[PDB]
Structure 1
């Protein structure tokens, strides 16, 4: 199995206590490290901030400590949006410019591959034709990577892409059989499945549906999402399940109604370190628990939730990661990806479960152990 781990560039800018630098990642913890976000300029991949170059150096330097470790550079993300991608895939000229820039960039900075994270071909403004054009881009990129590998007699660069977790988004943006032919891995975004804008409490990454889920909501769970991808042609071994190292917060309409599906008013207040209304890093959830929140296990979905006064949080803990890891193995999947590693309790200071409690759980349960480690 693979255990991929995202490192986000902005994690180092948080208050020192929550600040995380790529060079401080345990080199033996994961099989792949993914640097979250390269930018794009004139249809070419590039850095988002010039200081990112130092990050690349530190991140890839970890490979001297774990010779089997691979690194990937991700481009895109939710905030980036679809527009730059729509323009880049619109013509053969633009795609060639992009593909060649990727090979040059990854080889220059010692990355082993690319992680395409177009948040969404076919939706959010991206026209229907982008479902086909995204597939064309992926096929052309894979071909170029194969050709470069043969010409230089070195291992081929890896090509991966995120895959939506929302069914309607999968339908409008992904030619699954074609994409599965050309991609090495598909990182399925099995997270952010329920959020405050729903009007009721809901889990971030439930394994199974809640008995309260109705209609399309009954598909907002890991099992249903992965089943959809497989039923539509994705190679099971290429599917990498998303494991969130954070939860979502809600303000309860009634502090007496605290279960799944309870009415809510809005997102909860931002955490001290992550500063994002509606979200808390796993380490911030540990603080919430330590300071008195009532913790409950939701067996139907096999994930925890906690509440204090009118604040409710749906998240993932060691037990939910363990159960999902077993399920992943039972379903012959390719592995897991922790999103984002910088929100796990990397210092061990917040949860008292040692360093990287969530990710370490997956390392053990997925039998991750490289020869040089």
Structure 2
């Protein structure tokens, strides 16, 4: 199994114990590290943060401490939107300019591949032709990577993609059978499946549906989404299940109604480190849990929730990570990906569960820190 760990280049700005940079990553926890995010200007890949060049070097230097480790650079993300991708895929000239720039950039800085995180082809302003043009891009990139490996006599750069977990976005965005042939791995965003924007409490990454859910609400769970990808053409071994190391917060409209589906008035309060209303890192969650919150196991969905007065949290913990890891092995998927390693209790000082408690849970469950043949 693989364990793919996203690192974000804005975690460094968080105050105090929240600041996280590549040298804080345990090089043995994951099989692959993915750097989020690069940008694009005039159809060429580029940096975004002022010190990305320095961070790229520290990130790829982690491979000097783990000979099995591979790194990828992710391009795009939610804030980046779709317009640069639409322009880039619109012509063969622009796709070639982009692919050439990617090979050069990955080799320049020491990355082993590119993770495409276009959110999403065919949505958020992207026109309908982008569904097929995304396939064309990926095919052309895979072929260019295959050719560069032979010409340079080196292991091939990998092409992966982070892909939607919502059924409407999946159907508008992806030609699953052909796309899956050319991607090396498919990183499915099986999280953000509920949130305060819906007006009621719900879980971030529930494994199964809640018993009341019918119609399209019955699709909002990890099991349905991963099986949708598999059943519509993606091989199980290329499918990577998304695991969030964060939770979503809500304000309860009625504090006496604190189960699933309780009406809410908006996002919960921003945490002091991540400073984003509606979102808490796992280490911020532990502070909440230890400050008088009531924790409930949502047995139908195999995830915890917690509440305190009018604050409600849908999240994941060691138990839910363990349950979902057991399930992914039972279903022969390729592994797990975490959003994001900088949200784990990397110092160990918030949760009293050791360093990197959520990431370590997946490393142990998926046999990541193991060997087969004796070696030098």
Q: Could you report, residue by residue, the CA deviation over 1:146-182 in whole angstroms, capped at 9, with x for unpaired residues?
A: 0000111100001100111000100000000111100
Rounded to whole Å, the distance in 1 between the matches of 2:231 and 2:31 is 27
User: How many angstroms does 1:134 deviate by?
Assistant: 0.4
Q: Could you report, residue by residue, the CA deviation over 1:22-51 in whole angstroms, capped at 9, with x for unpaired residues?
A: 111000000000000001111000101231
User: How many angstroms does 1:212 deviate by?
Assistant: 2.1
Give the equivalent residue in structure 2 for 1:106: 106
Check the 8 A contact 2:247/2:280 in 1, yes or no.
Answer: yes
Give the equivalent residue in structure 2 for 1:240: 240
Check the 8 A contact 1:11/1:19 in 2, yes or no.
Answer: yes
Give the equivalent residue in structure 1 for 2:315: 315
Structure 2: which 5+ residue stretches go unaligned? none
Check the 8 A contact 1:66/1:370 in 2, yes or no.
Answer: no
User: How many angstroms does 1:220 deviate by?
Assistant: 0.4
Give the equivalent residue in structure 2 for 1:175: 175
| 2:227 aligned counterpart, secondary structure | helix
TM-score for the superposition, normalised by structure 2: 0.98
| 1:200 aligned counterpart, secondary structure | coil
Rounded to whole Å, the distance in 2 between the matches of 1:56 and 1:161 is 20
Rounded to whole Å, the distance in 2 between the matches of 1:68 and 1:148 is 21
Structure 1: which 5+ residue stretches go unaligned? none
| 2:125 aligned counterpart, secondary structure | coil
Give the equivalent residue in structure 1 for 2:53: 53
Give the equivalent residue in structure 2 for 1:162: 162
Q: Could you report, residue by residue, the CA deviation over 1:1-42 in whole angstroms, capped at 9, with x for unpaired residues?
A: 000101000001001211111111000000000000001111
Give the equivalent residue in structure 1 for 2:324: 324
Give the equivalent residue in structure 1 for 2:206: 206
Give the equivalent residue in structure 1 for 2:115: 115
Runs of 4+ in structure 1 displaced over 6 angstroms? none
Give the equivalent residue in structure 2 for 1:340: 340
Aligned residues: 373
Rounded to whole Å, the distance in 2 between the matches of 1:49 and 1:257 is 43
Check the 8 A contact 1:164/1:170 in 2, yes or no.
Answer: yes
Rounded to whole Å, the distance in 2 between the matches of 1:23 and 1:59 is 7
Rounded to whole Å, the distance in 1 between the matches of 2:269 and 2:213 is 26
Check the 8 A contact 1:68/1:370 in 2, yes or no.
Answer: no
Check the 8 A contact 2:317/2:358 in 1, yes or no.
Answer: yes
Give the equivalent residue in structure 2 for 1:10: 10
Q: Could you report, residue by residue, the CA deviation over 1:171-199 in whole angstroms, capped at 9, with x for unpaired residues?
A: 00000011110000000000000010101
Give the equivalent residue in structure 1 for 2:88: 88
User: How many angstroms does 1:369 deviate by?
Assistant: 2.0
Rounded to whole Å, the distance in 2 between the matches of 1:7 and 1:148 is 27
| 2:213 aligned counterpart, secondary structure | coil
Rounded to whole Å, the distance in 2 between the matches of 1:370 and 1:329 is 16
Check the 8 A contact 1:283/1:350 in 2, yes or no.
Answer: yes
Rounded to whole Å, the distance in 2 between the matches of 1:309 and 1:269 is 13
Q: Does 1:275 align with 2:275?
A: yes
User: How many angstroms does 1:210 deviate by?
Assistant: 0.3
Note the aligned Cα RMSD (angstroms): 1.0
User: How many angstroms does 1:370 deviate by?
Assistant: 5.6
Which deviates more, 363-372 or 128-137? 363-372
Rounded to whole Å, the distance in 2 between the matches of 1:317 and 1:107 is 37
Q: Does 1:222 align with 2:222?
A: yes
Q: Could you report, residue by residue, the CA deviation over 1:41-63 in whole angstroms, capped at 9, with x for unpaired residues?
A: 11000101231011111111110
Q: Which residues in structure 2 correspond to 1:63-82 (within 5 Å)?
A: 63-82=63-82
